[PDB]
Amino acid sequence: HSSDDDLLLPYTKSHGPSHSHRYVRDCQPVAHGTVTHETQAASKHSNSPVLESNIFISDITDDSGTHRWVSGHITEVHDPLRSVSVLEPGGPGGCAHNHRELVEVTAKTRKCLVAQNGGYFDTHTGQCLGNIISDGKLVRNSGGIQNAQFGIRKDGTLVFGYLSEDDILDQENPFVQLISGVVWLLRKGEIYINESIQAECDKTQETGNFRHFVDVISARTAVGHDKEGKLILFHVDGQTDVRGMNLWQVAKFLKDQNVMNAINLDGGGSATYVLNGSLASYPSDHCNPSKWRCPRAISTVLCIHER
Amino acid sequence: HSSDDDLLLPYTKSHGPSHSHRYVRDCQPVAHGTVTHETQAASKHSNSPVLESNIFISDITDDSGTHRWVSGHITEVHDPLRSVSVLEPGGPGGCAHNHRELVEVTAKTRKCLVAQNGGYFDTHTGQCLGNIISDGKLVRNSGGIQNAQFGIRKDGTLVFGYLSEDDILDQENPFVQLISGVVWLLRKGEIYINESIQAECDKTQETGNFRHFVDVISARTAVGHDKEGKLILFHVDGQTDVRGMNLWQVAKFLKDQNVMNAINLDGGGSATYVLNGSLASYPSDHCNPSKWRCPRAISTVLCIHER
Numbered sequence: 001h002s003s004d005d006d007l008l009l010p011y012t013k014s015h016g017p018s019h020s021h022r023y024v025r026d027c028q029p030v031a032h033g034t035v036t037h038e039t040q041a042a043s044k045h046s047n048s049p050v051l052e053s054n055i056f057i058s059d060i061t062d063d064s065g066t067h068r069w070v071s072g073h074i075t076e077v078h079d080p081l082r083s084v085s086v087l088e089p090g091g092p093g094g095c096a097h098n099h100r101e102l103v104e105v106t107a108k109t110r111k112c113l114v115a116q117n118g119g120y121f122d123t124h125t126g127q128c129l130g131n132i133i134s135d136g137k138l139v140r141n142s143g144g145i146q147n148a149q150f151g152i153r154k155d156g157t158l159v160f161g162y163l164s165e166d167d168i169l170d171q172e173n174p175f176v177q178l179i180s181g182v183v184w185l186l187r188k189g190e191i192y193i194n195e196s197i198q199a200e201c202d203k204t205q206e207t208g209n210f211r212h213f214v215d216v217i218s219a220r221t222a223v224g225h226d227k228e229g230k231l232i233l234f235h236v237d238g239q240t241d242v243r244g245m246n247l248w249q250v251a252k253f254l255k256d257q258n259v260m261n262a263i264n265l266d267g268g269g270s271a272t273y274v275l276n277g278s279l280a281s282y283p284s285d286h287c288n289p290s291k292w293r294c295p296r297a298i299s300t301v302l303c304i305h306e307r
Numbered sequence: 308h309s310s311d312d313d314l315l316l317p318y319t320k321s322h323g324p325s326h327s328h329r330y331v332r333d334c335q336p337v338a339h340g341t342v343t344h345e346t347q348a349a350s351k352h353s354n355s356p357v358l359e360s361n362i363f364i365s366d367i368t369d370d371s372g373t374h375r376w377v378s379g380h381i382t383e384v385h386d387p388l389r390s391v392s393v394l395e396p397g398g399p400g401g402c403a404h405n406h407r408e409l410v411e412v413t414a415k416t417r418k419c420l421v422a423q424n425g426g427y428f429d430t431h432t433g434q435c436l437g438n439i440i441s442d443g444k445l446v447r448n449s450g451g452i453q454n455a456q457f458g459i460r461k462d463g464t465l466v467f468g469y470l471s472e473d474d475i476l477d478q479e480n481p482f483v484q485l486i487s488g489v490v491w492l493l494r495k496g497e498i499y500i501n502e503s504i505q506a507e508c509d510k511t512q513e514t515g516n517f518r519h520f521v522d523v524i525s526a527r528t529a530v531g532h533d534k535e536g537k538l539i540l541f542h543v544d545g546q547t548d549v550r551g552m553n554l555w556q557v558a559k560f561l562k563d564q565n566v567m568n569a570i571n572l573d574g575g576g577s578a579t580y581v582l583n584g585s586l587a588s589y590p591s592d593h594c595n596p597s598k599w600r601c602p603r604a605i606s607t608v609l610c611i612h613e614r
């Protein structure tokens with residue numbers, strides 16, 4: 001569909017770090033003890049609408065003193081357990097076929113009110129990446145790859161952070177939704193990017209390219225939660241090294257929206273915001289072969305649907 | 308609905324100029340003869356889709372040498388006669404009730420594939436402005452107010468330019484759609500703003516405010532056609548004196564898109580692009596009372612619907 005020309009790649013070769021969850025615990029800062037994740041009971045506002053979606057057009061400043069206009073959406077979800085779903089591309093079984101699909105197409109399979117692009121994927125093979133649990137079904141076990149995680153448990157517990165392979169296979173209170181990103185933006189209402197860089201990039205990888213992935217501006221998406229337990233979906237349009245935000249700016253932006261924990265999902269040309277099946281953002285990838293903009297065929301999708 | 312705080316008003320009092328169509332004809336350049344409008348047989352591609360919608364994100368330069376990013380939509384219509392409709396706000400009878408309504412609401416009354424804000428209106432009273440013909444019904448006769456016009460005739464003829472009161476009341480080949488804007492951007496593939504300034508503003512209006520309305524950057528919408536007879540719908544997001552384009556920039560942009568004739572419709576906080584009933588642009592008005600952005604309650608709507 002698109003030319004795939006706005007690539008925002010955190011890893012030059014193999015996705016994710018090579019070291020184990022135990023290593024993440026050992027390098028993690030003393031302030032957090034030995035637990036490498038955060039939990040929050042999801043809100044249960046059964047008397048509210050499913051969601052509230054807001055458009056922002058904001059003036060962002062960076063350490064250079066430079067000002068930039070940015071535009072995007074913040075989406076608040078009032079009953080995450082009953083309305084949030086991780087979808088495979090195109091429908092159930094998509095990841096098994098290395099299928100890539102537009103967000104709007106995947107979104108129409110479940111009548112999503114708001115849908116955004118989800119996790120990372122191989123742009124050459126279409127292979128899905130990270131851990132994936134869709135509507136209680138386990139879709140992909142990364143094998144303990146230490147990337148920022150977001151999941152919902154059967155009892156409504158929201159989960160953010162780093163999870164071991166055994167964490168996601170637990171049957172006592174099983175995950176019903178699970179998706180992986182890259183970089184833990186906020187932990188306990190504080191910026192956590194430096195810690196993420198140490199945990200999600202290892203000695204055998206070039207930390208420079210990864211730090212550049214963190215520092216460069218581009219289109220970005222993120223998911224988090226607030227003090228009330230509502231789920232926060234973040235999206236900002238951009239183009240790598242031209243428009244949008246870097247992760248430091250996203251973290252500060254969300255921190256000033258009372259977001260307590262959030263992880264960064266796929267961005268660049270993948271960032272998409274679909275409103276009721278209709279593309280409602282400006283993607284960065286050029287079309288094949290025009291200079292028009294085209295949304296990218298991506299992998300998993302974050303869907304917010306009727307309860 | 309919105310705070311209505313991004314106002315882009317061409318006239319300080321009343322609306323339109325006071326001089327007659329005869330006066331406009333006499334000032335027109337000899338290169339165009341004595342006819343003050345352009346015609347084009349609408350395309351009849353019954354074997355094509357209804358429309359094609361494209362997103363642009365373009366680098367615009369102004370006489371200051373400064374570069375700015377702009378984003379919006381170009382929409383091509385393949386059977387304008389059977390798929391394009393001028394709608395009253397909220398539905399038939401709206402203009403008589405000084406009703407204002409969101410584009411998405413008015414658009415859902417006719418299952419519009421693409422809908423944009425249409426003509427100008429009084430922001431205090433809700434009064435509709437200009438000539439208005441909706442689905443063959445005459446809605447409002449301005450009385451010969453000389454503003455840029457766009458209309459479709461019963462036999463498919465697309466009409467752009469300045470029309471006398473008798474022109475629109477003709478029954479030989481009656482207008483089935485008609486709407487009024489402000490400023491004729493392109494005539495015969497050439498920029499026509501200078502001529503429009505002479506025709507659509509006279510001494511009884513604040514000429515300063517009008518020239519500022521032309522020169523300032525803001526959100527803008529426009530409608531035009533190409534040699535193939537397709538209808539071209541233009542929209543660019545912005546905010547008066549901060550983001551977007553001025554009419555000089557809109558005109559050049561369309562001229563480089565093989566547009567042959569085009570007029571400027573309502574802009575600023577009114578500029579809206581609704582895709583299949585879903586808001587698919589970033590409006591400029593702030594919400595009441597948050598700092599989020601809200602679409603504006605407007606008057607007439609340009610609707611592209613099933614054949």
Ligand SMILES: *[C@@H]1O[C@H](CO[C@@H]2O[C@@H](C)[C@@H](O)[C@@H](O)[C@@H]2O)[C@@H](O[C@@H]2O[C@H](CO)[C@@H](O[C@@H]3O[C@H](CO[C@H]4O[C@H](CO)[C@@H](O)[C@H](O)[C@@H]4O)[C@@H](O)[C@H](O[C@H]4O[C@H](CO)[C@@H](O)[C@H](O)[C@@H]4O)[C@@H]3O)[C@H](O)[C@H]2NC(C)=O)[C@H](O)[C@H]1NC(C)=O
Pocket residue numbers: 370501504518521522
């Ligand atoms: C349509 O009308 C245009 C004028 O309309 C008004 O201005 C606009 C911007 C609105 O405000 C509108 O509401 C007004 O009614 C008219 O624009 C003019 O077009 C001519 C071309 O024929 C341009 O000529 C060049 O002028 C510059 C000077 O401009 C600079 O300095 C002045 C200082 O007074 C500033 O006001 C301007 O903003 C600029 O900063 C000359 O430097 C230039 O000559 C030099 O360059 C050429 C080649 O590069 C050489 O050959 C020369 O020897 C010189 O080296 C041109 O003479 C003029 O700038 C422009 N005016 C404005 C304000 O932009 C337009 O031409 C009309 N269209 C038609 C088809 O007639």
Ligand SMILES: *[C@@H]1O[C@H](CO)[C@@H](O)[C@H](O)[C@H]1NC(C)=O
Pocket residue numbers: 191194
């Ligand atoms: C993160 O580390 C970088 C230098 O490596 C620098 O911005 C600062 O020391 C740290 N900032 C935060 C917010 O942790």
Ligand SMILES: *[C@@H]1O[C@H](CO)[C@@H](O)[C@H](O)[C@H]1NC(C)=O
Pocket residue numbers: 276277583584
């Ligand atoms: C979503 O789109 C469908 C078809 O485009 C429409 O019928 C439905 O009303 C929309 N949903 C909402 C909540 O407006």
Ligand SMILES: *[C@@H]1O[C@H](CO)[C@@H](O)[C@H](O)[C@H]1NC(C)=O
Pocket residue numbers: 277278418420583
């Ligand atoms: C628009 O809605 C119609 C339903 O009438 C649907 O058939 C079509 O696929 C939709 N197109 C887009 C781009 O959403």
